[model samples]
Target: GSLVPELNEKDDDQVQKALASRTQLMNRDNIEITVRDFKTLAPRRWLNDTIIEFFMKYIEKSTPNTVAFNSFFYTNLSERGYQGVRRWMKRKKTQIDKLDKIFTPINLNQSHWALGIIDLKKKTIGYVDSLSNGPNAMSFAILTDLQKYVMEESKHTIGEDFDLIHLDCPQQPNGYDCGIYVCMNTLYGSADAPLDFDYKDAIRMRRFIAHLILTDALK
Candidate 1:
């Protein structure tokens, strides 16, 4: 009966308590879920890296052997180039050479968030920006950097330099929801599900994300 992890009153009470309390709820893999980060899921509060990274990790955990980088990967690469984030390949023990696909969320000028998918199987690189701007300059640039990284790190090429394209994704009507959109896009895209959400779902998703964090489950 529950497809979106709808939170009931009792669950809401629990999540609200976690959000209201000023304490650390979880710390794993060096990603800490403090009250500060947890409360960002409330209302129109913008999400921080903590929430985004945790959500992506959840997606990776639920999906069978799917690979995803933490939120910091894009910023590090964008600022300092591939060498800045190159160690992550071996750090995560990621074999991009053998993967069918890889996922990562990108933060743009600290104003927007988007999802990037390197579909090695289909030999295509797609960007899912919830603002519906399609592939912009930053997206194009990131694709180029990642294309090079794939070859340099794994000695393999993707899609003749990886056919860059814009993947159909939910467009956010408001500014603050881009982070949520990134997480949801990664979840759906990684599993081959359609972008079956809209602005109306954002309100529900904000809370659903909170529920997911509190309970540590994707269902």
Candidate 2:
């Protein structure tokens, strides 16, 4: 059950063929995807934010009525503190105004990947983890700082100043697939998803992202 169109289960052979093509495409300057990442199927591996951010942009562009922010853009927000949030608000003013749903990726133990979401219209902040094991609660604490950022920058203030709720998303079976769960939950929040991503879903995601980079120029 792949949510991605042109992707599915029961097709390792087909996916292999696509990777074959992707290997050739990878040599082109315009196509920035790497095929080796999907070669292993027993246990999935990490996907860096650079590629994930690319898909977020692809989803935002392909899905009308949705605006997704860059994964790399919000990384050090909490570490930067209050006035830092103040500066970010002024800098990203226009993008903030256009976003109705904001997705954030968080690091757990500096080893795991988790996701946080702010639904502007719902007035709720949500956290998602790939493993059933809960993420550090502080991941959600920054919403208040974010709200403060919005209030200081815009006339119409959005989001809650309270605790964020946990979003029930699909969990991962292995240690490495946490990144996939993070990616899946992110897509789930913004573009709609198949309840969860399985081992096969991880494979499809690898191929999907590899091809996605080819869609745009070097960044």
Candidate 3:
């Protein structure tokens, strides 16, 4: 009920049909591999963070004046160390410099999905996790990595120290919905208005993502 464009029974049915059609198209079209993974009920049912990352890039590029938080080098800066990350961003500098924020979905221990955001205007790093098992260890370490990146790129320092605040985000009432919440947190800021969605709104996100792909547009 909290989701935007609240889907009544009729609207919900329409959305389901749209999703089914997307499924059919995915079956036939020679789409990208990331999109291929999205066609599976099990995979889409628990969408991977990387898949969401691809969609994030798609949304950012298509929408005008909407260069959002970059998911591009990842916490690669942290895990892989700084040189490679800087090199990658350097190659993509033209696009990377334009981002107003960075909404990164971090995968912890090769499991669990969490969003790490570098909100430049606010000068803060916000971590929004639907299921928090205390502060994210990896996310916290990566904040410093992001800080170094900002200093070198934009001349302004960010995520300096302990700026990783756990925001009061929508929680995953069901364990299976963490991925959905991570998706919501990324879109929440880019969207025109606040998202009041939660676990119950899970499938609606799937439908909306399908509808977006179908139209190649963001409403």
**Top-TM-score candidate index:** 1
Residues 137-211, model 2: lDDT tens digits = 465464554555455445545443534677777666577876666666777677554455566665556655544
lDDT of 2 at 212: 50
lDDT (tens digit, per residue) of candidate 3 on 1-219: 343344467655654555454433322112333344555323236666544654566556654434444344665765665565656544434544465566666665556777777766566777677887666566566666666766655544433542656676776766666666776777776653464665656666766665444454432
Q: What is the full ranking by lDDT, best candidate first?
A: 1, 3, 2
Q: Per-candidate TM vs. native? A: 0.90, 0.70, 0.72
- The digit string of per-residue lDDT tens for model 1 on 1-219 reads 323556799988998788778487777766778889999998888988889888877777777657788778877877887788778877766677767777888888877888888888777888788886755678789788667767766755444567878788777887778898888788777777788777766677778878777775633
Candidate 2 worst ten-residue window by lDDT: 22-31
The list of candidate 1 runs beyond 4 A from truth reads: 1-3, 157-161, 217-219
Alpha carbon lDDT of each predicted model:
0.77, 0.56, 0.57
Better of 1 and 2 by lDDT: 1
TM-score of 3: 0.72
Query: Which residue ranges in model 3 land beyond 4 Å of their true spot?
Result: 1-36, 40-44, 62-72, 87-99, 155-162, 192-195
Q: Model 1 has how many clashing residue pairs?
A: 0
Error of 3 at 178 (Å): 1.9
Off by over 4 Å in 2: 6-43, 85-97, 142-156, 161-163, 192-199, 215-219
Question: Residue pairs in steric clash, candidate 3?
Answer: 69-101, 69-102
